[PDB]
Amino acid sequence: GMTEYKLVVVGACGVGKSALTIQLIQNHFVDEYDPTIEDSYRKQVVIDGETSLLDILDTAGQEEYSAMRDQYMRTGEGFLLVFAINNTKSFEDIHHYREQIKRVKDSEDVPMVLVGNKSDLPSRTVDTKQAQDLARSYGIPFIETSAKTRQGVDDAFYTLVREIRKHKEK
Numbered sequence: 304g305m306t307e308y309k310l311v312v313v314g315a316c317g318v319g320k321s322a323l324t325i326q327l328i329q330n331h332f333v334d335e336y337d338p339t340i341e342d343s344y345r346k347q348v349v350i351d352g353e354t355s356l357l358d359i360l361d362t363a364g365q366e367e368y369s370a371m372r373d374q375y376m377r378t379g380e381g382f383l384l385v386f387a388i389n390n391t392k393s394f395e396d397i398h399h400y401r402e403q404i405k406r407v408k409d410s411e412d413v414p415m416v417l418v419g420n421k422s423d424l425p426s427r428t429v430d431t432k433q434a435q436d437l438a439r440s441y442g443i444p445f446i447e448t449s450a451k452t453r454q455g456v457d458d459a460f461y462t463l464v465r466e467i468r469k470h471k472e473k
């Protein structure tokens with residue numbers, strides 16, 4: 304059979320949400336993708352032997368809350384919390400994203416993965432250990448990725464799927 308998973312990618316402007324999503328759906332890097340485009344994208348893959356249909360919402364635009372947007376954020380089953388390893392502000396923003404997800408899902412038990420993107424870049428400002436400690440306090444996996452080289456990209460999305468599977472067993 305197959306299973307479908309609704310995945311949502313969140314994080315500050317410019318951390319690489321669109322680049323990560325396009326790497327997964329199209330298997331290549333983009334230098335430039337309209338930062339205002341918020342949309343969902345479908346991709347069939349195979350995860351641990353099971354046909355998996357991923358429906359990936361790539362968030363964008365500006366901060367604002369509507370019934371429309373709360374509803375389609377709430378339909379997400381799991382969330383990638385993306386920061387860039389060379390941008391401390393994006394790391395400091397993760398708390399905001401996690402608390403907004405908890406609000407819209409009305410739950411403290413939401414599948415999430417912390418993603419430190421742009422790992423190919425030399426100018427790191429967020430120590431891997433700091434991100435690991437945060438993920439440990441959240442109870443979630445942490446994966447470092449590069450949308451440019453594709454390092455860790457499949458691992459981030461597939462790990463989120465596995466976190467969803469565990470949640471659905473409850």
Ligand SMILES: *CCC(=O)N1CCN(c2ncnc3c(F)c(-c4c(C)ccc5[nH]ncc45)c(Cl)cc23)CC1
Pocket residue numbers: 313314315316317338339362363364365366367368369372373376399400403404407
């Ligand atoms: C450069 C443009 C870009 O990529 N973004 C990212 C999305 N933006 C944004 N900024 C601050 N907070 C945001 C949010 F809180 C949400 C959000 C969450 C996380 C959960 C539930 C929501 N319901 N409505 C909005 C919700 C989103 Cl989707 C985006 C946020 C700025 C521009």
Ligand SMILES: Nc1nc2c(ncn2[C@@H]2O[C@H](COP(=O)(O)OP(=O)(O)O)[C@@H](O)[C@H]2O)c(=O)[nH]1
Pocket residue numbers: 314315316317318319320321322323333334335336338420421422423424448449450451452
């Ligand atoms: N070197 C490098 N650049 C990246 C990476 N991911 C995204 N970018 C670049 O960072 C910028 C912002 O990426 P984008 O996907 O638009 O971020 P978004 O605002 O979160 O959707 C783009 O110029 C991308 O080419 C990465 O992993 N490594």
Ligand SMILES: [Mg+2]
Pocket residue numbers: 320321322336337338339340361362363
């Ligand atoms: Mg984008």
